[PDB]
Nucleic acid binder design. Structure first.
Ligand SMILES: [K+]
Ligand SMILES: [K+]
Ligand SMILES: [Mg+2]
Ligand SMILES: [Mg+2]
Ligand SMILES: [Mg+2]
Length: 189
RNA sequence: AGGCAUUGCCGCGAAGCUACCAUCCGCUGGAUUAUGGCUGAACGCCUCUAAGUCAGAAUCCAUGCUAGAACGCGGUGAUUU
């Protein structure tokens, strides 16, 4: 069954301005600007008014129509990111060896450096993606906080960090050491 | 001082050849697999997967290394009385 018409609504809030042309979406808000190429999907965007964009699929199968609500979310997340922003919190976990995290520079680059992970002499390095901002909370012990407009950049940068601290040749039910995401949320709440 | 003994035999023997029996030398990028993830619908939830995407193997392709198509090509010198 091909559905004649499926349609999602994207609610644009007051401060933000969505430009779309040949499926290249630019969102511009208080916190800054995000773009996103969507030329990999056949959808049609339409402006109802200044506060509402519709996105529609015509004559689409089940798989095509599944993409449509994805498109809504990706554009909605662009808008959330450039008003409310994104902030992921990660805790360190360790039995014995204190994980020792800090920001460095390797040719004006920026890198989350992880020392002493399970007492390892290896120094782990994780690039900080452009537009992500790291900070170590004071109130909470052993907490790193990644933050940015782009949830895809923020969230991936946290995953990069979670994954660098995987435990090898040990039973990971026992050896629970790592840097895990504890809280996904916004900057302004 | 030499011949012959099918190189007469013995010790040393330079050069050459040669031995893990000797010495030297044996490169670093990218793309991936399994797998673990990100964002995320389908399915108001969930989900690494469907669109999209990150990391990743003694793998693969380059880099590097050998040959150089005798019907692949370029540059350049001189061209006879
Ligand atoms: K003789
Ligand atoms: K998810
Ligand atoms: Mg064991
Ligand atoms: Mg896919
Ligand atoms: Mg030839």
């Amino acid at each position: 069954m091909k559905y004649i018409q499926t349609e999602q609504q994207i609610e644009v809030p007051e401060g933000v301005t969505v430009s779309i042309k040949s499926r290249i979406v630019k969102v511009v808000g208080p916190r800054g600007t995000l773009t996103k190429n969507l030329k990999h999907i056949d959808v049609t965007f339409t402006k109802v008014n200044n506060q509402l964009i519709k996105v529609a699929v015509h004559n689409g199968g089940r798989k095509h129509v599944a993409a449509l609500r994805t498109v809504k979310s990706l554009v909605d997340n662009m808008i959330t990111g450039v008003t409310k922003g994104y902030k992921y919190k990660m805790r360190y976990v360790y039995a014995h060896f204190p994980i020792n995290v800090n920001i460095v520079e390797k040719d004006g680059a920026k890198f989350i450096e992880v020392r002493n992970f399970l007492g390892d002499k290896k120094i782990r390095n994780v690039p900080v993606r452009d537009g992500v901002t790291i900070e170590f909370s004071t109130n909470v012990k052993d907490e790193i906080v990644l933050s940015g407009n782009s949830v895809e950049d923020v969230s991936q940068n946290a995953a990069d960090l979670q994954q660098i601290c995987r435990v090898r040749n040990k039973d990971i039910r026992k050896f629970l050491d790592g840097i895990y995401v504890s809280h996904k949320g916004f900057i302004t709440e």
